[PDB]
């Protein structure tokens, strides 16, 4: 029947510059990181059973900047332009760019006591559209949100958005890293050469 | 019976107003009692109007009995329509 | 996470001539009634859990017309022309524009005694066709129609069909008003100002 | 009947130099932020069943600044005008203007473990002056209180001061942002246009 | 029969540079460290219980770089060249180059609360290849190796791989050290003379 | 940190002529079949908890020919050089290419009623010289063997042996497909490109 996996890695790398920078992840195998993308592409359909993203800092304790994160659901509302508009979506989590580390233990899954600082925050799996999504290429989701972003609804279940700002160079700096950890169920095998 | 209806050409409704009811507890005082309120009056545009739900404003009698205590609280309160006109209105 | 409403507000004015005039409503929280539509816009999905529908007569008992109302499910389908074709929908109730007053009862809760002859219809929640539907503007829905009707099934529930005839003159006359009552959860908040 | 509604959201942006600078805000629906003074809009009065402020940094471990919260309650009492007069306030917290991350779990409501070091505060939301407070919006409190303060105490709970101080610049260094988590009840729904 | 050894040591001194830098140890007594390599020679098999690899910062919050490590298994595999490669790794862990104190605590084994900011993998010691491994030297090994890759999966249970970058300078600048700390189990007696 | 699949994909596809043509597959998932080829790439290490391979028929009752299967576990000992050979390894089955069709409910999971008539063998697992071994690639593995052929015992449990012969044609006439059937256990994750 169902095939279950729980992994961790590392989904997006992170620059801080002066002024407000928007971005978004879909919520989907192909996108949430490189090695998903390829072993989910075997089977036709999965249901996640759980999706937390972490962000972990490599910058010094001196880095000015600062983090912020959320979900949205429905393709076509606007991104969030603002830390203000961004602070009321679900899953909001903001946080110094040089702070974060305590979210390791989600990523190699230990005893987790000093989460209170962990700029880390979960999707909520059950409120999602339906269960069972289709594998779909970000070429092929693409085309299809081309022609009207409402098409997105039946095939992505959230988007996490992203804004760096307060930074101190107009040149971007690094700052850190995001990391998907996810457990995911995934049903109807086929050739991966065939999925799109 | 169950789904039907017949608009009668007019509605009928004898008010009798009966004695107001007073009485005194340990401290407290309750009076129970029905006044007429308002008038109503239709146009063929809409015409908004309010009531403050005080004793002063809200009856007549109620007006000058309740002036004789500081303070009051509403124990209930409802105001009930009854008509005066056809069914052709 | 899930936020509950329930109320019941004006949702449509209704006027009868002697002509067929057939009109629908989406039941969605937009076009449901301009409270929710502003209330439901601070979150991004809904699920309905309950939805009724009744008219309230505002005429004399000399206003000759029938009001006729059922549901349609699928955007795609042809809107009923004729009286007949929609007596066939689900939740298919007509009654007669003077009539109605017990269903005043649904509208400000208070204890109901026999509602056989309110006009009053109610939405199949449960045979619904998902239960979390993102919230949307009309226009970004018409946008989407626009480009296939199809693509309203990701996104609406279900349609409200209405029909006045019977009516004795030729320009409108005043008859009644169709009042929503319905508890509604809203999930996962947003900006209303991106909603769409 | 009651309405309840969680949620979190940013109530205000911060910044250090190095002179005291005494601030505050009402603490009612219509200032504590965006969201829900929009939502809130859509109902008569309200009732605080929880509310929290909790000062998350955005500037390197090495920026000098101190911030300062707590509550007041008699609009007509005097601002505090150092740092001494208001830690005498109920819900008095200081710290770093760096520091106060392990608050971030307060927002988006996970574990808390590491929490001596939020500087967060809650308002006494028992031994408030009533339960049942009207909506009002800042235009209108404004001119009432123009009138005589006192005219507030029958309008708005409490306010909550903020001061800072002990930076190093004479003009402003960005330090961080005040986040406000709350849970309400809201009751006598009206058309928001008409709320004052 | 078996004789069971709990000890910690240091396995290797850090540095960061500006550029990736991926190394790797081979997770076996005689690489291991000084004090394990001495000891485990006057026996002729083993069997690891526990490893435990914990990385300890010794620069200042203001150094720029940070600490990648995860496990391998099949010594012919390519060793990664990149920390999105890297991260996929069983027993991943990043994190700031001046990070990772709280892991102090695995080293002279005392109660451990706050290691939610551990730098500091476990090795999988039960999904290893066999029980009982071959003590071996590094030149031996060596030798073994340059015939084929895949005499050592005989020989060798698994191999730690560091990588270090986001450092600021092109020349290496200490971070820290990483420090072994295992629980092992010997068997067969030899003169460590003739342990090769 | 095992994640378990369960599949049964087409492994290979067999031809019969005139005279005997032996062939052999080495039962490690690179070779088992492709689609598993690529899922267990991600990998490290695997553990076979079942495997069964099915011969099912596609040509006609009219097709002359025999197919013989049997399991040889040392890499080293020399393949079957006539069917006789064969008959004497662990595991042999040997049918007629047009027969073996109730052996389809191995493929499809549905219940099996009498399989006596199925041409299909299974490996004993339990049996094997190791439960946890290494992914390889057949040319890696080429190349270890190159070197060395005793070094394929540490890589793979064992290798099956398939002969055809009895055919009428000088020319190979389609006679079925070989099914493989498994329950595997994957560990310790790595990216693809670098298993080897
Ligand atoms: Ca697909
Ligand atoms: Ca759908
Ligand atoms: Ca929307
Ligand atoms: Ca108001
Ligand atoms: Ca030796
Ligand atoms: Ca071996
Ligand atoms: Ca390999």
């Given at each position: ?17 002066d ?8 919520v ?17 359909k999965?249901?996640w ?5 972490t ?18 659901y ?12 961004l ?20 990523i ?28 779909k ?60 | ?11 009928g ?29 239709v ?31 509403w ?15």
């Amino acid at each position: 029947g169902a095939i279950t996996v729980l992994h961790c890695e590392l989904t997006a790398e992170i620059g801080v510059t002066d002024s407000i920078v928007v971005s978004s992840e879909l919520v989907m195998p192909y996108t949430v990181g490189t090695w998903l993308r390829g072993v989910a592409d075997n089977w036709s359909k999965y249901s996640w059973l759980s999706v937390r993203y972490t962000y972990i800092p490599s910058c010094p304790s001196s880095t000015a900047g600062s983090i912020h994160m959320g979900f949205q659901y429905d393709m076509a509302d606007t991104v969030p332009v603002s830390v203000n508009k961004l602070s009321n979506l679900r899953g909001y989590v903001s946080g110094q760019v040089w702070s974060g580390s305590a979210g390791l233990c989600f990523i190699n899954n230990s005893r987790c006591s000093d989460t209170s600082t962990a700029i880390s925050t979960t999707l909520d799996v059950s409120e999602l559209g339906k269960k069972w999504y289709p594998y779909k290429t970000s070429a092929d989701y693409a085309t299809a949100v081309g022609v009207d972003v409402n098409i997105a609804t039946d095939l992505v279940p959230a988007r996490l958005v992203i804004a760096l700002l307060d930074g101190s160079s107009s040149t971007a700096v690094a700052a850190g890293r995001i990391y998907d950890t996810y457990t995911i169920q995934m049903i109807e095998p086929t050739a991966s050469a065939l999925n799109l | 019976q169950a789904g039907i209806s017949m608009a009668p050409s007019a509605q009928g409704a004898m008010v009798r107003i009966r004695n107001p009811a007073v009485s005194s507890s340990r401290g407290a005082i309750t009076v129970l009692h029905c006044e007429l309120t308002a008038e109503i009056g239709v146009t063929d545009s809409i015409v908004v109007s309010s009531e403050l739900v005080m004793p002063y404003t809200v009856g007549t009698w109620l007006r000058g009995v309740a002036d004789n205590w500081s303070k009051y609280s509403w124990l209930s309160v409802r105001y009930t329509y009854i008509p005066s006109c056809p069914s052709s209105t």
